[PDB]
Scaffold this active site. Structure first.
Site, PDB file in Angstrom:
ATOM      1  CB  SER A 161      -0.964  -0.064   1.165  1.00  0.00           C
ATOM      2  OG  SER A 161      -1.898   1.003   1.129  1.00  0.00           O
ATOM      3  CG  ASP A 164      -5.646   1.953  -5.453  1.00  0.00           C
ATOM      4  OD1 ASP A 164      -6.354   2.449  -4.562  1.00  0.00           O
ATOM      5  OD2 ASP A 164      -4.446   1.631  -5.292  1.00  0.00           O
ATOM      6  CG  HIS A 208      -5.387   0.069  -2.051  1.00  0.00           C
ATOM      7  ND1 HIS A 208      -4.398   0.817  -2.654  1.00  0.00           N
ATOM      8  CD2 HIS A 208      -4.939  -0.225  -0.813  1.00  0.00           C
ATOM      9  CE1 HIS A 208      -3.383   0.945  -1.820  1.00  0.00           C
ATOM     10  NE2 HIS A 208      -3.697   0.323  -0.683  1.00  0.00           N
TER      11      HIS A 208
HETATM   12  O1  LIG Z   1      -4.361  -0.727   2.221  1.00  0.00           O
HETATM   13  C1  LIG Z   1      -3.956  -2.002   2.474  1.00  0.00           C
HETATM   14  C2  LIG Z   1      -2.795  -2.195   3.240  1.00  0.00           C
HETATM   15  C3  LIG Z   1      -2.357  -3.471   3.514  1.00  0.00           C
HETATM   16  O2  LIG Z   1      -1.238  -3.634   4.262  1.00  0.00           O
HETATM   17  C4  LIG Z   1      -3.071  -4.600   3.033  1.00  0.00           C
HETATM   18  C5  LIG Z   1      -2.650  -5.932   3.302  1.00  0.00           C
HETATM   19  O3  LIG Z   1      -1.539  -6.182   4.034  1.00  0.00           O
HETATM   20  C6  LIG Z   1      -3.357  -7.000   2.816  1.00  0.00           C
HETATM   21  C7  LIG Z   1      -4.516  -6.784   2.060  1.00  0.00           C
HETATM   22  O4  LIG Z   1      -5.186  -7.888   1.627  1.00  0.00           O
HETATM   23  C8  LIG Z   1      -4.954  -5.519   1.776  1.00  0.00           C
HETATM   24  C9  LIG Z   1      -4.243  -4.390   2.251  1.00  0.00           C
HETATM   25  C10 LIG Z   1      -4.671  -3.064   1.990  1.00  0.00           C
END
Ligand SMILES: Oc1cc(O)c2c(O)cc(O)cc2c1
Length: 411
Positions: free
Chosen positions: A256, A350, A378
């Site tokens: 992210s 996203d 996202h």
């Molecule tokens: O905005 C985010 C930040 C993350 O760290 C995420 C993650 O570790 C797994 C996921 O399945 C979606 C994420 C979405």
């Protein structure tokens, strides 16, 4: 207007229903991932969260949130789980103790989502970290905290970079192992992305997990675009000192907001990294007035733009927008420099960071590896995780058994 500017077009003007109330956040966005034990509920249980959600919903909490009032709703449950863990540890029930410490850490975590902006959220961060490491220390293969000396720190920066560290057994200077450096996000810190570490261990890969500037325990100056550069110099100096790690096989994976830092460091630290991965990162248009003025109301559970402003050390969104252009990897010349191997992955749709920033990343400097995920928002899940594991397995010559690795993620 803004409705014509980005790939997703007029999708930026449609407010997401989860902003109306916590009830809508829970029912339409959070209940499902909590049931499945995935982000943001890794190590967590619906048995813990549902009673807390019901109490928050009866209280009718909604934006704008009072973060002390919000955080306090999670505390009785977090404490109950920590007391159960302590009694299990006293009885020698190691597997149970570990589970309940991590369940406690998950409840504290969500209490300080999206980022600690009140005293009780700052408290929850400290308490969640404490119970996470008690849980981690009682894992079959214990994950430890390493307080890496910030030798590259300057005036006003913290003295240490606190990281998670896991080294697979039989790893040594004689038989050294690759290392996946995980860079965490705006809300998920080292206590969250910890969920990846046992998977990598099982494939003979070390992990180091570090937070981005202005989150978790990052010692980095919030407003200084060069603060991450110093942080990674300290972290990579420490990994090089660990002779059980092959310093020629470090892969940085940014999650992210972490994606921005993974992309940045592919340039700043090219010669010290085999590869970097940006999963749902940005680069340039993530700092746009137009994008930030719309993102508060879109797919992010809370107030993305305000939260990002706070993480960058600004007292409000307008002051952040006034100066945000200086963090752009395009504006600051980063994307013109040579890079190590870069893999860019994101959902086209996203609404946290624009897919337009993958385009900017591919419009400058050397060619980069990309997978776009059409019709996903996202992170482009779940396909993104399979794409990235497949590529890292190929890069490091691992067993290629990515389904086995991914199955270890859900709690
Ligand atoms: O905005 C985010 C930040 C993350 O760290 C995420 C993650 O570790 C797994 C996921 O399945 C979606 C994420 C979405």
């Amino acid at each position: 207007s803004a409705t014509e500017k980005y790939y997703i077009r007029d999708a930026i003007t449609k407010p997401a229903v989860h902003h109306e109330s916590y009830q809508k956040l829970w029912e339409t966005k959070w209940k499902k991932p909590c049931e499945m034990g995935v982000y943001p509920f890794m190590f967590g249980s619906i048995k813990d969260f549902e009673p807390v959600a019901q109490e928050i919903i009866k209280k009718g909490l909604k934006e704008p949130y009072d973060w002390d009032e919000y955080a306090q709703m999670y505390f009785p449950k977090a404490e109950e789980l920590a007391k159960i863990a302590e009694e299990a540890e006293a009885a020698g029930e190691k597997e149970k103790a570990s589970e309940y410490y991590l369940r406690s850490s998950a409840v504290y975590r969500i209490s300080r989502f999206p980022t600690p902006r009140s005293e009780k959220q700052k408290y929850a961060w400290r308490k969640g970290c404490e119970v996470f490491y008690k849980g981690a220390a009682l894992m079959e293969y214990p994950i430890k905290e390493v307080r890496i000396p910030h030798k590259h720190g300057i005036e006003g920066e913290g003295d240490v970079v606190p990281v998670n560290f896991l080294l697979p057994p039989n790893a040594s200077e004689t038989s050294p192992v690759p290392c996946v450096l995980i860079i965490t996000g705006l809300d998920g810190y080292r206590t969250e992305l910890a969920v990846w570490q046992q998977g990598w261990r099982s494939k003979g890969v070390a992990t180091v997990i570090a937070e981005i500037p202005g989150t978790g325990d990052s010692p980095a100056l919030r407003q200084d675009p060069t603060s991450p550069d110093r942080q990674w110099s300290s972290v990579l100096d420490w990994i090089e000192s660990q002779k059980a790690v092959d310093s020629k096989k470090i892969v940085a994976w940014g999650f992210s907001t972490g994606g921005y830092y993974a992309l940045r460091m592919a340039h700043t630290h090219k010669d010290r990294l085999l590869a970097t991965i940006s999963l749902g990162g940005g680069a340039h248009h993530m700092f746009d007035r137009e994008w930030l003025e719309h993102a508060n109301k879109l797919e992010y559970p809370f107030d993305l733009s305000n939260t990002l402003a706070y993480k960058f050390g600004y007292p409000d969104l307008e002051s952040f927008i006034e100066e945000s252009s200086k963090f752009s990897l395009l504006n600051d010349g980063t994307l013109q420099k040579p890079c190590t191997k870069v893999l860019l992955v994101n959902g086209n749709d996203d609404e946290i960071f624009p897919i337009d920033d993958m385009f900017v990343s591919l419009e400058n400097g050397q060619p980069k590896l990309a997978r776009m995920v059409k019709g996903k928002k996202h992170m482009g899940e779940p396909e993104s995780f399979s794409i990235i594991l497949e590529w890292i397995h190929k890069l490091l010559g691992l067993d290629g058994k990515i389904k086995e690795q991914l199955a270890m993620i859900p709690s």
